């Protein structure tokens, strides 16, 4: 197995860190799929699943890997990566490279520049867990069938504030979406009932779900900026699929019910 990436562009470097901070809040342990074309953060279990598409040729300046089957499935703790990328903010260059000194790791070498002529270097050895070809099939992108309703999602900031306050009421939550772009958030206890009504949400090309508010709140927390694409695909049965595409980074989130 081979893997050597390298980032130099500031905008990309910082933006890459943002992505790690996000996934660190959506999953304690994730799976990193290394493809010659793109990178992916995957996980599946509460049976929530996450799929993060990332165009490699849009972040790194130098990139190369080796699988016949050019592809690598690594299992790492999200926290370890984020902390490793935290010091790469005011950094000059970033070099992530698959290693195996003491044990299979993902070395994240960082070059920090300063008023000193001598270059500062910080290396992180992220413990890795290579997944056999046997499970390669169970870590593929989740399937999005025929959404009973496909409505555009309101500003996440507002939706988040509402979910926050509703969590202090009940652990359950009913999300409803119509055709005239009407998204509703309903919580009901034997003492207090709260219902929020959104309207005018497009959906060019009713469905209720009883998911727990605790996991819905997790999804809205990871987002620190308004996505350039917010779709809420609902299946009246027991599924809520969120499709985001901020810039060139795709994010798919799935939340079951019952």
């Amino acid at each position: 197995m081979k893997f050597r990436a390298k980032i130099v562009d500031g905008a990309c470097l910082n933006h890459f860190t943002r992505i790690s901070n996000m996934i660190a809040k959506l999953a304690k342990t994730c799976t990193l799929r290394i493809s010659p074309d793109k990178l992916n953060f995957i996980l599946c279990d509460g049976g929530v699943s996450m799929w993060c598409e990332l165009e490699q040729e849009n972040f790194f300046n130098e990139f190369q890997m080796e699988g016949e089957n050019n592809e690598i499935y690594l299992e790492l703790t999200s926290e370890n990566l984020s902390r490793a990328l935290k010091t790469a903010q005011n950094a000059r260059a970033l070099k992530i490279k698959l290693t195996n000194k003491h044990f299979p790791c993902l070395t994240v070498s960082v070059e920090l520049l300063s008023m000193s002529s001598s270059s500062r270097i910080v290396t992180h050895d992220i413990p890795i867990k290579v997944i056999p070809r046997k499970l390669w099939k169970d870590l593929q992108e989740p399937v999005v069938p025929d959404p009973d309703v496909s409505i555009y999602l309101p500003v996440l900031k507002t939706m988040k504030s509402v979910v926050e306050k509703m969590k202090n009421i009940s652990n359950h939550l009913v999300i409803e979406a119509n055709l005239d772009g009407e998204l509703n958030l309903k919580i009901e206890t034997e003492l207090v009932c709260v219902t929020t009504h959104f309207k005018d949400l497009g959906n060019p090309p009713m469905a209720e779900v009883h998911i727990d508010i605790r996991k819905l709140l997790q999804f809205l927390a990871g987002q620190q900026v308004n996505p350039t694409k917010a779709l809420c695909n609902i299946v009246n049965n027991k599924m809520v699929h969120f499709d985001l595409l901020h810039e060139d980074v795709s994010l798919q989130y799935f939340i079951p019910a019952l």
Binding site: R83, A84, S116, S118, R120, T123, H124, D125, I126
Partner: protein, 254 residues
């Protein structure tokens, strides 16, 4: 005792007390002919620190050593000194009076336990290895490490360059390693290959105080086992830390 700390020196005293908090749970006081000595010791007797305050104000004694709960004396400086004057005297009870603004006064009657002094065997001049660099630099050298990191190893790699490496005792942990050039140091007198391991959380306590004062910190270490000696000196301020170093069979006890 008769102390009258004013101006920025008040905050400096506070910062000093805060540093002695991240190492010990009891503050040892001891007025001397050269200044005010604030000392402390680790619960496991594997760490010691001391701040000598040569006339940073208006000192005077007799008309005296003692010991208070570090956290009690800390609450007085936690945010209360956020204060133009500070009088530390003795009644009867360590009295710490704060002459705040608008006229508001904050007197502190702190009970304590009169005991003996805290001596300890050091010898930086006899310490084989040595290095000296701006605190600001060392503070940057520890940034890559997690705040929860307990132990870190300071070593000298081939090429005359210092290297801080994370220490740990199939859930493998991430090993962080910071490497600094010789040019970052004002002095580097250490043998290549030699490396010691000490407490980071305690080392930060001193480093945080040396940074805010913009001062230079010098480390004196020997062989794995014998304590490491950290030193900082100011125009009218003195302080030094001493931490235990791991070994082979032992578990870092001194």
């Amino acid at each position: 005792m008769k102390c009258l700390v004013t101006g920025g020196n008040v905050k400096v005293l506070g910062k000093a007390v805060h540093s002695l908090s991240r190492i010990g749970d009891e503050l040892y006081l001891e007025p001397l002919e050269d200044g005010l000595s604030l000392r402390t010791v680790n619960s496991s007797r594997s760490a010691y620190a001391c701040f000598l305050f040569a006339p940073l104000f208006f000192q005077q004694y007799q008309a005296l050593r003692c010991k208070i709960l570090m956290k009690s004396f800390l609450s007085v400086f936690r945010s209360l000194a956020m204060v133009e004057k500070c009088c530390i005297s003795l009644n009867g009870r360590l009295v710490v009076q704060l002459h705040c603004k608008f006229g508001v006064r904050k007197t502190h009657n702190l009970s304590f336990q009169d005991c003996e002094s805290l001596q300890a065997v050091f010898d930086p001049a006899s310490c084989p290895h040595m290095l000296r660099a701006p605190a600001r630099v060392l503070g940057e050298a520890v940034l890559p490490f997690s705040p929860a990191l307990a132990e870190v190893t300071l070593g000298i790699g081939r090429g005359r360059r210092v290297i801080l490496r994370s220490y740990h005792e199939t859930a493998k942990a991430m090993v962080t390693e910071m490497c600094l050039g010789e040019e970052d140091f004002q002095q580097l007198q250490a043998q290549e290959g030699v490396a010691i391991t000490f407490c980071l959380k305690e080392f930060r306590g001193l480093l945080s105080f040396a940074e805010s004062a913009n001062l230079n910190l010098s480390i004196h270490f020997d062989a794995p086992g014998r304590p490491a000696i950290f030193t900082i000196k100011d125009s009218l301020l003195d302080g030094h830390f001493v931490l235990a170093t791991l070994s082979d069979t032992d578990s870092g006890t001194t």
